[PDB]
Paper text:
The [name] plays an essential role in the control of the cell cycle and the protection of the genome. It functions primarily as a transcription factor by binding to specific DNA response elements as a homotetramer and integrates a multitude of cellular signals via protein–protein interactions to initiate the appropriate cellular response. This functional diversity and adaptability is provided through a complex domain structure, which comprises intrinsically unfolded N- and C-terminal extensions and linker regions that flank the structured DNA-binding domain (DBD) and tetramerization domain. Most [name] cancer mutations are located in the DBD.
In order to elucidate the exact nature of the interaction detected by NMR, we solved the crystal structure of a DBD construct comprising residues 89–293 at 1.68 Å resolution. The crystals belonged to space group P21 with two molecules in the asymmetric unit. The overall structure of the β-sandwich and the DNA-binding region, including the zinc coordination sphere, is essentially the same as reported for the DBD variants with a shorter N terminus. In both subunits of our structure with elongated N-terminal tail, the N-terminal residues up to Trp91 fold back onto the DBD, in excellent agreement with the analysis of local chemical shift perturbations by NMR in solution. A sharp turn within residues 94–96 facilitates this folding back of the N terminus against the L2 loop region of the DBD. The turn is stabilized via a hydrogen-bond network involving the hydroxyl group of Ser94, which is within hydrogen-bond distance of the main-chain oxygen of Thr211, the main-chain nitrogen and oxygen of Ser96 and a highly coordinated structural water molecule. The Cβ atom of Pro92 packs against the aromatic ring of Phe212. Key in positioning the extreme N terminus is a cation–π interaction of the indole ring of Trp91 with the guanidinium group of Arg174, which packs in an approximately coplanar manner, the preferred geometry in protein structures. For the two preceding residues, Pro89 and Ser90, no electron density was observed, indicating that they are highly flexible and do not significantly interact with the folded region of the DBD but point away from the structured domain. The short segment around Trp91, although not essential for the overall structure of the DBD, contributes to the thermodynamic stability of the DBD by folding back against a nonnative surface patch on the canonical DBD region.
Residue numbers in the entry: 91 to 289
């Protein structure tokens, strides 16, 4: 696969709308589906399972705002390599009828989801309309699904990745950015507790 000639910025930018991310406070019981470590800024999740990510703003972005998610390798020497699904999963029969079979990150439960293969940078990304929080709610939740394990040979192959979440206006202008590390693994709860053990 062709390397990208560029690397997306991962610099945090709250912007005019005071944009940042939140995650459920899920703990590390062995049963948890998805769990986020504030100390590591790292989400631990399972293949193809719901991964809630919260959008928090201080003021409401204008109508037509969109929310984009994109993965990059965390290690500088792999950064120009496009993060994609391994050949095995690229060929498996788990299509949801909306997502490209090579894309690592999907969004579930949203029929307005849109996927992009960037024709210049080669990066994959997934975008949904920004929706303000339901009345009485403090944030907007997106349900992401990661469609390969961190260990997948011929794919991520045990290399750490970051998900970059950006807010953009209807014309593509950057309004906000935040990011977090992701490990897609068999037992998120155990793995988080173990990785934090090294602190
Ligand atoms: Zn895979």
């Amino acid at each position: 696969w062709p390397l990208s000639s560029s690397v997306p910025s991962q610099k945090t930018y709250q912007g005019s709308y005071g944009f940042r991310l939140g995650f459920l406070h899920s703990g590390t019981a062995k049963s948890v589906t998805c769990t986020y470590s504030p100390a590591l800024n790292k989400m631990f999740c399972q293949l193809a399972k719901t991964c809630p990510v919260q959008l928090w703003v201080d003021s409401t972005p204008p109508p037509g705002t969109r929310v984009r998610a994109m993965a990059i390798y965390k290690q500088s020497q792999h950064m120009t390599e496009v993060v994609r699904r391994c050949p095995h999963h690229e060929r498996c029969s788990d299509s949801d009828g909306l997502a490209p079979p090579q894309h690592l990150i999907r969004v579930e439960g949203n029929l307005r989801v849109e996927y992009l293969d960037d024709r210049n940078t080669f990066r994959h990304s997934v975008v949904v309309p920004y929706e303000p929080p339901e009345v009485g709610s403090d944030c907007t939740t997106i349900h992401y699904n990661y469609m390969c394990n961190s260990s997948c040979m011929g794919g991520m192959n045990r290399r750490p990745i970051l998900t970059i979440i950006t807010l953009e206006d209807s014309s593509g202008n950057l309004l906000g950015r935040n990011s977090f590390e992701v490990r897609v693994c068999a037992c998120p709860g155990r793995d988080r507790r173990t990785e934090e053990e090294n602190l």
